[PDB]
């Protein structure tokens, strides 16, 4: 139907805007700490600690399959990246500190993304 196409165009355009948001958030991680999944070869106990691992490559795979229906879903995954790190790693670590900086810097980006998602519909 024409309605299904219109909905699909909206989803495509959201995917466009979330791709730009993803690029901007990932620039706030220049050390690439959050670029890839935590390696279960290198951190064999990880899933005992963290039940829903997340990372920017895994988000990008979902994004490109148009798997985020709304900004809330995308933000859920971004928060998992930060929150998982802040639990597994101690406060005095470069990992934790990276996550704090990413959260703080990403907040700005996500604040305007919400306005654009509402504004453009």
* Whether the Cβ atoms of residue 116 and residue 13 lie closer than 8 Å to each other: no
| C-alpha to C-alpha distance for 6 and 22, rounded to whole angstroms | 24
Structure tokens at 54: 């997340």
Q: What is the CA radius of gyration of the chain?
A: 16
Angle, in degrees to the nearest 10, between helices 71-88 and 2-27: 30
Pick 1-121's CATH classification: 1.20.920.10, 2.120.10.30, 3.30.310.50, 3.40.50.620: 1.20.920.10
> From CA 3, how far away is CA 48, in angstroms rounded?
45
């Amino acid at each position: 139907s024409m309605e299904q196409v219109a909905m699909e165009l909206r989803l495509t355009e959201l995917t466009r805007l979330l791709r730009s948001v993803l690029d901007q958030l990932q620039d706030k991680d220049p050390a690439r700490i959050f670029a890839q999944p935590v390696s279960l070869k290198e951190v064999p106990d990880y899933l005992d600690h963290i039940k829903h691992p997340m990372d920017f490559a895994t988000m990008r795979k979902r994004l490109e399959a148009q798997g985020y229906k709304n900004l809330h879903e995308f933000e859920e995954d971004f928060d998992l990246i930060i929150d998982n790190c802040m639990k597994y790693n101690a406060r005095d670590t470069v990992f934790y500190r990276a996550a704090v900086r990413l959260r703080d810097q990403g907040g700005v980006v996500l604040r305007q993304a919400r306005r654009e998602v509402d504004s453009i519909g």
